[model samples]
Target: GGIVENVRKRPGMYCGDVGEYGLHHLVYFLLDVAYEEARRGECRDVVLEVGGDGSIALFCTSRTVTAENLVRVATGAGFLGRPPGDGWGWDSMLVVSLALSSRYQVDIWADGRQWRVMGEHGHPQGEGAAVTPMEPMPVSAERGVRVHFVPDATIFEVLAFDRARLSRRCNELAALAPGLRVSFADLQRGERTLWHLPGGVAQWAHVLTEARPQLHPEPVVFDFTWDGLRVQCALQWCEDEDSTLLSFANAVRTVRHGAHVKGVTQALRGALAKLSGETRGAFPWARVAQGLTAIVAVSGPRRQMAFAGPTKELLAIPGLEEAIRKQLQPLFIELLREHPVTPALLARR
Candidate 1:
C-alpha cells in the first residue's frame, strides 16, 4: 500500500527475512540496479565495501533514471558500488529508499558539489520524508552515487556478511557484463579483489564447469535475436543430478522458474524425443536431460515481467516459452549432428 509497508510486513516476500539470505538480497538488489546502468552505457566502475560493523558502503557511476524524475537519487563516481513493485509496485530506486528506512545516509555530488541528503527514512509513508540538502561536504569522486547504511538489527537477525559470497557475486556480475570491472573490499578482513571480465556469461560458464568437472557432454552455447527478444543460452552436463538452470532478465537473476524456463524444458523434451526416435510424451524428459546444466538469459524492452509471487523470483511472461522454444530447437538439432558419438556413448552407458 505504501513505502516500506510490504517489506516491513512480509520481510520474506522481498528480501529473505532479516537473515543471511535477506542480507545478501540487499546487496544483490543494489547490484542489479548497477547492472542496469552499465548495460545502458550510463556508468562503468563500481565497488562495494563491507564494513566490520554490519555496514555497507557502495558507489557507482550509472544513469538509470532521469534526473528531472529522480527525487531521492544519489551521485558520486569516487567511492564504489552498487528491486520491485507489487500495489506493491517495485522500483529499484525505491530499493534504496526502503533500505534507507532502516537507518541510512547518502551523499549526492552534482553541480560540482557534494551534499548530504535526507531520504525516505524515519518518517511516515507519504512525501512525509524528503531529500533535503545540507551544506556541501568533501568528496573524492567526479560523478556517481555513494550510499552508507545499516539494516535494522531489530528486523535482521544475522548481520554478518560472507566475503566468499561477495567475491563470487562480483565475479558473476562482471561475467554478465562484458568488459565490466568491479571491486570488492572487506575492511574487517583486509581481503579485496578487482574483477575485469570480457568473456561475459560465456566466461562464467567455464568457471562453473571447471568447478563441476563431470561435464560429460560439455556446454552447448547459442545466441540470436528473434521476435524482439535477445536470447543467450549455455548448457552443459554434470555427472551428478545437480541439473540446474539459471535465468536472467536483463542482468538480474530470476530464481523462480518462469515461461523462459518452461520453454527451454519443453524444447529439451522435444529434442530428446526426436533424437531417440521416441514419440512426444512417450519419453521421460528427466532421463534425456539427465545431468544437464543450462543457463538462459533473455533481454528486451518489450518484455513485461510478471511474477507468480511477491518476491519477483518467479517470472511469468506469455509467449516467452514459444519464443525460446523456437530458438533452442535448432541448436539442439545441431548438437545431435555434430556430437553423434556422445549419443552412442549414452546408449552404451
Candidate 2:
C-alpha cells in the first residue's frame, strides 16, 4: 500500500505525467523488462496485444518466467534481478503500474504447468494466486509469462494507445537487439504484424535514408568495443538538406543527444575537415552535418550509465566522448577513404 499509494499520489514523478506519453510509458517499461529478461544467444521474440477494452498484454515468445518469481508476485513484494548479480529490482516499476492500473494479471507457463496471479486497483488477490497443472497447448515448446493490465480511468487522461507509435518503438527494439522478433497484435484495430531486422541499426539507417538520394550506395556499419564501451553505429552521407542523428543508451532512445552524440559529431567533423584539404581553419560542422543520417547506439552495465532523469532522454556517461572519439574518429576516416568520390560529393552538397 505504501509504494502503490505513493505512486498514485504523484504519478508524474515515476512516469513523467498522466498524459499520453506517460500512459504509453507504462507499456514501454514493461517492454524494457521483457527485453532484459530475454535469454542471450537465443531467438528473443516479444508479443504485445492491445485489446478493444483498453487492456494491454505482453509476453515473450522465448524465455520463461521462473516459478520462484511467481510466488513473490503472489505476495506482491520485492524483486530479484533477471541476472542475480545485476541487483536491479522491478518492485518500483511494477508497483507504479499496479497503482495506475484498474486491473492487472500475470499468467506464467513452465514445464507443462501454469500459474495465474490477479490484482485490482494495485493490490493482489490472495485467493486468485495459484498454480495448476494443465495440458500443453500448441507451441508448447515455448514457455514464458504474459502480463495484462488496464490503465485506471481516474489516473489517466487518455487510455487509447497509438498503433503507429507502438509499432515504431517495437521496430527500434528489433533493430537494437539484432535477430530479435516482435509481434504486435492490435485487437481493437484488427491488425497484426511482425518485425525482424537482423541487420540491426545498419538496416535501420538504410530505411531512414531510402527515400533520399545518396552520395554512397551503402551505409558504413560497425559494431565494436572501445575502452570497454560497446558501440554500434550506422551512418551515410545523403543528398537531403537536413540530417537525422539518432542515439540510444542501453536500448532506450536518447531523444536529447548526449556525450555519444557529441563524440560522433566531433569525430565526423574532424574527419571530414581533413578530407576537404583545410586542416587549419575552423571546421564548418554545418557542411559536414548537412545531408548526414546516422544512428549511434551504446549499451553496457546499467550501473555505469547515468541519465538526466527518469525519462532517460539523455545519456551522461562520464568520459564517453573521449572513448567514442578515440575509436570512431580514425575509423570514419579509414572507412570513408574507401569511397574516395563520396567525400567530394558531400563537400559539394
Candidate 3:
C-alpha cells in the first residue's frame, strides 16, 4: 500500500525548515491573491479557515472579475486541480456548478423565478443546465448566481498562507494606484485583523517626518468622497522609499508617479520655496517625496468608477480629479504660509 510520507522527514524541503522566514511564508501565501484582487479593483472581502486535517481553505468573492474567469484562473493556477482544463470553459457556460459540502444548496434567482441549482452531492436537481464546477459560483445571471461552500480540513489549512500574501500584495498595489478602495482581513485563532488605507499625505509632508508612527497595528481604512463622486482609499506609509503605491481591486500594485502624486509634490515644493524666498530651481520631486509612505483605496458607485490599473478596465468617475486637487492643494498652500524658509527659492526658478 502506498501511503503519504511525513513532512517531518524533510521539513526543510517542505517548508524551508521552520524559521522566521518559513513562519512569514505561512502568512504570505494565504493573503497574497486576496490582496492582489483588491488592488485590481476587485472586492476586498476575504475569509480564511484552518482545519483539524492540517489543511487550509480560503474563500473570496467580489464583482471585479466575471464568475467564469475566476474559476478558470483558480483551476488553471493549480489551486483547484480536480477537473483539468484551460481557462476557456468559464465564459461559455450558461450556468456554473460548484462542488461544495452537503450542508448547503445552490439557490439561483433570475427573471423572477428561483431554482435550486445544486443538490447534496453537488449535482443540479432541476432541469436547469449544468455548466462546469468552479470554486465560486454566481459570476453573473440572467437572474443571478449564488453558491455555498462548506470546506473540509485540507482546504482550511491552506487559508493561512492565503491571508498573509494577500495583505502584503494589497499594500503594494495601493501604493501604485492611489485611487481605489483596498482592504484586507486576516482570520486567526478567533481573532480578525482588518487593515485600511491612510490619508494626510499633506500633513506628513509639512511635518518633515519620515514615517508616522502606525496609529494601529491593523491596516488603516479610509472613506472619502472626491468631487461629487464618493471613493474610498486605505493606506499605510513605509520608511524605505519616498513614493506612493496604489493598488486596484487589491490584485496589482501600481506606481503612481503621474499628475496626481506629482501635483502634490510640486505644490509642496513650490510652497516651501516661496516661503523661504530662495531662488532655487523647482524643488526636486525626489527630495519632496523623502520619508513618505502611503496606501490609498479608491472606489465609487458603478457609474462613476474609473479603472486605471494596467488594464484601464473601468471608467473614470466624475469629480475624482477635482476632489484630489482640492485635498492636496490646500495642504501645500498652508505649508508655505507656516514655513518661512525664504522667497528666493521661488526666484531661483
TM-score of each: 0.73, 0.87, 0.41
Measured with C-alpha atoms, the lDDT of residue 293 in candidate 3 is: 44
Q: Which has the higher lDDT value, candidate number 1 or candidate number 2?
A: 2
* C-alpha lDDT of all candidate models, in order: 0.61, 0.72, 0.38
How does model 2 score by TM-score? 0.87
**Candidate 2 vs candidate 3: which has greater lDDT?**
2
Highest TM-score among the candidates is held by which one?
2
lDDT tens per residue, model 3, 1-349? 0101222233334334344444334334434444444334454444444433323333444543333443333222222333443331222111111222222333434343444433332233443434433233322323333334332222123322344564555454334333333344333445444333333222222222334543223332334555444333333323444455443322322344233333334445656565555432556645444433443444333223445553444334444555565665455557445433223333334
Clashes of 3: 90
lDDT of 2 by residue, 67-160 (tens): 5565454343553233234211233255566668888887777666776778788666664544655634323445667778998999999999
Per-residue error for 196 in candidate 2, Å, reads 0.8
Estimate, for each residue in 220-265, the C-alpha lDDT of model 1 and write its tens digit: 6767666666667777766666666788877767897687777777
